[PDB]
Amino acid sequence: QYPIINFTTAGATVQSYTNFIRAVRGRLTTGADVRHEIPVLPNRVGLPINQRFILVELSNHAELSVTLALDVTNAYVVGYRAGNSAYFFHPDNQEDAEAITHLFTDVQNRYTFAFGGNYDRLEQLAGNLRENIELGNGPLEEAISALYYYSTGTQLPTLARSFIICIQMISEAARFQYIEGEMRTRIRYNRRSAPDPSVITLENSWGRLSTAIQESNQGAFASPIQLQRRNGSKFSVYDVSILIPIIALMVYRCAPPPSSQF
């Protein structure tokens, strides 16, 4: 089977959440592929299916639990399994579709949504932008419940909001220690609050950065990447040097050229 990472919200602390995200990261990459100090995720083309996913099992304030499946090539969530059923976002190509059929194989019920995991559809399904969807311990606990009772009937809107919560707190937290940081702070000071423009813009640009960083001149971007501060103030990124404490993982965009010695 696939590697499994566990985490409970009930007694979750800053140490528990940090241990959780630090372990998820360690499963996503060897890695053993590092460029400008940032680890790269394995290349999708030719990834053997036995190495293609990781499993994240989430426990509620009640014992009820849900197991999430994350695509190793981009750390994104591809679907989940409530105990008796398995749900999957609509893949965008055949090879992807084939790959998920190796997930939760012993389950009895097997569904594939008529939509993908991209934030736009999830936002229209939830009725709210992630800008307007609180995150933190409370929201995650609350989310991982509606993900169980969906197989038993909690309509789509409330379900979509739960994905939005989980993806940011897990998929994005692994991608960005900055996003991991903000989650860690919401737990330390025990607050629930939506993400600010720095988190949202970081999410939107994780692929744009992965291209820039891997296609940079010794870390110099061929063109600047626009981001936003916590106050919504825009600013341009010209160099890998400043993202090193911000981003933790990149999607493989190309082979690593020979190093420029001397």
């Epitope: 609509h90 190509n93 097997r110 569904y111 594939t112 949504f113 008529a114």
Partner: nanobody, 127 residues
């Protein structure tokens, strides 16, 4: 909004064809199915087709399998039901069903999974 057309009248053992034309960009991601009600019987699952990204497998009920065939034209946003060697049992009103929530499901046969329904069209088989 499912627009169903093409019933008809046929001497037993012949052929007809029903078509359903949808209007929606995400049409390619829909689980699609046909249901029929024969008078005296309740509404009955007939056939289903999975979205391309959901395997795309086609499924039929045993009493209709072989004789019938379901297909979609994603470019034309149309579904088809080609019926061959029609028995008089096959005289019924037929419906299209589309799942906007679902691409593929082990429980496809359930009418509960489908959100949109074409207007029933009459198939008559004489002998």
């Amino acid at each position: 909004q499912l627009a169903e057309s093409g019933g008809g009248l046929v001497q037993a053992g012949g052929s007809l064809k029903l078509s359903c034309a949808a209007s929606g960009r995400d049409f390619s991601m829909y689980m699609l199915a046909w249901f029929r009600q024969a008078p005296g019987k309740e509404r009955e699952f007939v056939a289903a087709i999975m979205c391309s990204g959901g395997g795309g497998g086609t499924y039929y009920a045993d009493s209709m399998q072989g004789r019938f065939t379901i297909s979609r034209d994603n470019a034309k946003k149309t579904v088809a039901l080609q019926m061959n060697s029609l028995k008089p049992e096959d005289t019924a009103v037929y419906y299209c069903a589309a799942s906007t929530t679902y691409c593929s499901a082990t429980t496809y046969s359930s009418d509960r999974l489908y959100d949109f329904w074409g207007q029933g069209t009459q198939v008559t088989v004489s002998s």
